[PDB]
Amino acid sequence: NNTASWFTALTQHGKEDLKFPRGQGVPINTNSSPDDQIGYYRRATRRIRGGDGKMKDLSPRWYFYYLGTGPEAGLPYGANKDGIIWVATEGALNTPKDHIGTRNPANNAAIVLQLPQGTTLPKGFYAE
């Protein structure tokens, strides 16, 4: 509890999971260094009860966590797991970013997720 991504989410509207080209995907954060630009996105599925009384699936959201932090802090870069996709800027160090850690929403608002110029966002995905 009291732990969250440092950034706002990407919303999925299509059917394909989130995917980034090699070297792309890490959100902008001017308080981090080139060594830190590596991590993963984690899918969060939302389900609400619709008008018919049955549960309906909402659009999935994907949250970025620096490598070695977040709900899959123990996962090494590249580990295969459903809902987890890995991203890294070229040159980033394959080390845990415990100095960055996660965000306490009671203490800090989320950084608005932004991707650098030229990034290919897959079809159906949009930043909140």
Curated annotation (Swiss-Prot):
Q: How is it modified after translation?
A: ADP-ribosylated. The ADP-ribosylation is retained in the virion during infection. Phosphorylated on serine residues by host GSK3A and GSK3B. This promotes the solubility of homodimers that would otherwise aggregate. Host phosphatase would dephosphorylate the protein during assembly at M bound membranes.
Annotated effect of mutating E90D:
In strain: Omicron/BQ.1.1
Where is the CoV N NTD domain positioned along the sequence? 2-128
- Region Disordered, annotated ranges: 17-37
Record's signal peptide = none
What's this protein's family per the entry? Belongs to the betacoronavirus nucleocapsid protein family.
The record's note on quaternary structure and interaction partners says: Homodimer, homotetramer, homooligomer with RNA. Both monomeric and oligomeric forms interact with RNA. Interacts with protein M. Interacts with protein E. Interacts with NSP3; this interaction serves to tether the genome to the newly translated replicase-transcriptase complex at a very early stage of infection. Interacts with host NLRP3 and ABHD8; these interactions disrupt the association between NLRP3 and ABHD8, increasing NLRP3 stability, ultimately leading to increased inflammasome activation.
- What's the protein here called? Nucleoprotein
Portion of the full sequence shown: 47 to 174 of 419
